[PDB]
């Protein structure tokens, strides 16, 4: 604790706007793991002028991006999981202050318009932009380098120096200020210009860009960034799009590939070559009869429709349905022992959550707290229920779970998953909740508010045991859409009696139970509600089309 300790806060700015809009999964990875390395590029000022001890939180010890781009160390797929948090703070000298407060904003705007310079070469040379290498360095002029230049804003701030935690709650002061000192537009989020939008007419524009859809420079740059990655480290996201994640589900895919695969394959092909890439098909969506049959020699697309539905009805239906996953700590809340919280929640987020979630799906994002993942629907509920559990043994968390279709949206998917989190399970009084939702294709929407506990008790019971029954779920909930006049009680016990040799007593006996102590942890302020919520609940993880 050496020598005119003072106290520096980092904040990098927008994160929401940015990893908001992305309309594939490689782009929502793509805008979460480059604003964790913007952050990266931060810290690294810091470790050089002192040292890695010296950054109080996030905690650096078993930072994947510092092993790999620091110390050269060999991590291997660990590196695509974004860990790093977009506010730190750091120890350093009064006098360095200032100097690394530049140093730093430089050293993010140098690598952005790095990775920008990369990302039009890589664009022109790919064809994504169709343009000469003469007017490559239009794409370089002024105004676009002043967006990549001007698009985060970094915001650094300190104080100088057992009172520690005092201080510690005023960054956050100058530091909640300086976020709020300050042609055509992308098609892809729409927030920003288009490259040549200010020098073209619209069709001038639409038309030379791949897929008649401009970028501007902060999504040209998002798309460039999964082949900056793949070459710095030799790693890949293993599931690209969210069908894929989707048919994770009971390993329809592997099962599905090592009985039909190769005959799938060579039916597409048989349908046309550009169906089939590199012996594989190159669409996911391909595994759907549904995408043979109406999106784009319609007797051997017939072929491989016949061929499909055949094998459903051995192997089962494909999966259509994905889950996106997202966590956050409630209320989260001396120096050593700040340091020992951030060692803490480094620890969850770069260990614990890699090792619930692994190969089962997507780990977007673990930044202390937080949580991004997408899951197959199968897995969300565990995965979920595994994560709470263990950041409890280090203390509480909500979450929201969206099971949503795979043509759904992906931005409004995203939007619509932070909104069960936000507003509906940060709601509750006292947190500690998980929002599940479910969005069927049709456009109706399910929410059911529980406790983590309904996961175990539900788990442990033997109502769910039975239940893999329908109608009955059906009854209970037609009862609740306004209220049964002859109460919860009497309802509940009407309709389990009413579906169940003669050990029935001693089943409804149990089951009546279950439900009652499943209805304590399901959230809401009467029974009727409760019911709801259960019922709700159970219509979900039990639906045929979301669960095939
Ligand atoms: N690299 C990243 N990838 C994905 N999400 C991120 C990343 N960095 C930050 N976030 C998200 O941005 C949010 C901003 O958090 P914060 O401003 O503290 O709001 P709150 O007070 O609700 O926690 C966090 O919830 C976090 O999940
Ligand atoms: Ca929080
Ligand atoms: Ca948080
Ligand atoms: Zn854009």
Redesign the pocket.
Same mark, same amino acid.
């Given at each position: 604790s050496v020598k005119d300790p003072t106290l520096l806060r980092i904040k990098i700015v927008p994160?929401?706007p940015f @990893?908001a809009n992305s309309r594939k999964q490689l782009d929502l990875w793509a805008s /979460?793991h480059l $604003? /964790?390395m913007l952050m990266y590029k931060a810290l690294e000022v810091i470790v050089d002028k002192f040292g890695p001890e010296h950054v109080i939180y996030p905690s650096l010890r078993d930072q994947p991006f510092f092993l790999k781009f620091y110390l050269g160390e060999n991590i291997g797929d660990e590196i695509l999981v974004?860990n $790093?948090?977009?506010?730190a703070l750091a120890i350093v000298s009064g006098k360095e202050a200032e100097k690394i407060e530049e140093e730093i904003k430089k050293r993010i705007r140098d690598f952005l318009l790095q990775l920008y310079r990369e990302a039009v070469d890589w664009a022109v040379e790919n064809g994504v932009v169709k343009v000469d290498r003469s007017e490559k360095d239009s794409m370089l002029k002024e105004a676009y380098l002043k967006i990549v230049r001007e698009y985060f804003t970094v915001s650094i701030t300190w104080v100088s120096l057992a009172i520690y935690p005092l201080l510690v709650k005023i960054l956050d002061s100058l530091g909640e200020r300086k976020v709020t000192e300050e042609g055509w537009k992308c098609h892809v989020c729409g927030e920003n210009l288009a490259i040549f939008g200010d020098m073209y007419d619209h069709d001038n524009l639409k038309s030379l860009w791949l897929d008649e859809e401009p970028l501007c420079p902060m999504c040209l740059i998002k798309r460039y960034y999964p082949v900056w990655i793949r070459s710095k480290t030799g790693q890949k996201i293993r599931f690209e799009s969210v069908v894929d994640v989707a048919l994770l589900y009971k390993n329809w895919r592997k099962i599905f590939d090592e009985k039909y695969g190769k005959d799938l394959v060579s039916k597409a092909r048989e349908v046309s070559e550009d169906f089939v890439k590199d012996n594989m098909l190159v669409d996911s969506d391909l595994y759907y009869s549904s995408t043979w049959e109406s999106g784009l020699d319609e007797e051997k697309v017939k072929e491989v429709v016949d061929f499909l539905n055949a094998a459903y009805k051995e192997i089962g239906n494909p999966p259509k349905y994905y889950a996106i996953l997202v966590m956050?700590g409630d209320d989260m809340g001396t120096p050593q022992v700040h340091v020992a919280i951030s060692q803490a929640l480094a620890n969850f987020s770069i260990r614990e959550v890699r090792s619930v979630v692994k190969d089962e799906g997507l780990l @977007?994002?673990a930044?202390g707290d937080?949580v $991004?993942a997408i899951l197959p629907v199968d897995k969300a509920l565990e995965v979920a229920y595994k994560i709470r559990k263990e950041f409890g043994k280090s203390w509480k968390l909500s979450a929201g779970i969206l099971i949503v279709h795979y043509k759904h949206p992906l931005y409004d998917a995203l939007e619509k998953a932070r909104d069960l989190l936000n507003n509906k399970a940060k709601n509750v009084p006292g947190k500690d909740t998980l929002a599940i939702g479910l969005l069927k294709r049709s456009g109706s929407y399910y929410i059911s508010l529980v406790g983590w506990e309904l996961i175990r008790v539900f788990y442990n019971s033997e109502l769910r045991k039975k239940l893999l029954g329908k109608r009955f779920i059906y009854h209970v909930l037609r009862e609740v859409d306004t209220w049964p006049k002859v109460g919860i009680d009497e309802m509940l016990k009407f309709e389990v009696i009413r579906h169940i040799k003669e050990e029935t007593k001693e089943l409804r006996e149990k089951i009546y139970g279950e439900i009652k102590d499943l209805l304590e942890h399901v959230r809401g302020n009467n029974e009727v509600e409760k019911v709801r919520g259960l019922f709700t609940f159970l219509k979900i993880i039990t639906d045929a089309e979301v669960f095939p």
């Open positions: 994160v929401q @990893i /979460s $604003l /964790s974004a $790093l948090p977009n506010k956050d @977007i994002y930044g937080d $991004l």
